[PDB]
Curated annotation (Swiss-Prot):
GO terms for cellular component: cytoplasm. Belongs to the RNase H family. The lineage of its organism: Bacteria, Pseudomonadati, Pseudomonadota, Gammaproteobacteria, Enterobacterales. Changing residue 10 to N: Loss of activity. Keywords: Cytoplasm, Endonuclease, Hydrolase, Magnesium, Metal-binding, Nuclease. It catalyses: Endonucleolytic cleavage to 5'-phosphomonoester. The gene is rnhA. Mg(2+) 2 binds at residues 10, 134. Pfam families: RNase_H. It comes from Escherichia coli (strain K12). Residues 1-142 form the RNase H type-1 domain. This is Ribonuclease HI. One of its GO terms (biological process) is DNA replication, removal of RNA primer.
Length: 155
């Protein structure tokens, strides 16, 4: 039985925008849960954020998490943007709402309930779990069933 919760995530999209999906693997308690869904029109970035969102939202108690992903967008977000976004009130220098603020706020809310350790893997040097996430994400994008409500050409 593992003493730290392990989450692996990946997101994929066939266009900008186009149909896309995510894959997330969560090793929680003694189970290995797999989440995957496809959306009719979204972006690669929204899908990569959605993967991390659905895995975290599955946790019902405060946990010690290790999250592994090759997503550059989540890493830039987590490492360079989020901190300053919360102080500026989720605005850009020109005072508009940041891009995908809907997902970043949603992720921020989930991150706030846990102790997280981030593992930034390289795309061609991930674990077997990261590869499986890629496969799930690509599969979902091929048969999308949900609407990405939050998507905007806009803001």
């Amino acid at each position: 039985m593992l003493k730290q919760v392990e989450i692996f995530t990946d997101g994929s999209c066939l266009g900008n925008p186009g149909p896309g999906g995510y894959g997330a693997i969560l090793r929680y308690r003694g189970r290995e849960k797999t989440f995957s869904a496809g959306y009719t029109r979204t972006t690669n970035n929204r899908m990569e954020l959605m993967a991390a969102i659905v895995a975290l939202e599955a946790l019902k108690e405060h946990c010690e998490v290790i999250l592994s992903t090759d997503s550059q967008y989540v890493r830039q977000g987590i490492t360079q943007w989020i901190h300053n976004w919360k102080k500026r009130g989720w605005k850009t220098a020109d005072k508009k709402p940041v891009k995908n603020v809907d997902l970043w706020q949603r992720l921020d809310a989930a991150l706030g309930q846990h102790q997280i350790k981030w593992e930034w893997v390289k795309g061609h040097a991930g674990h077997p779990e990261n590869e499986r996430c890629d496969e799930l994400a690509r599969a979902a994008a091929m048969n999308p069933t949900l609407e990405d409500t939050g998507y905007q050409v806009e803001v």
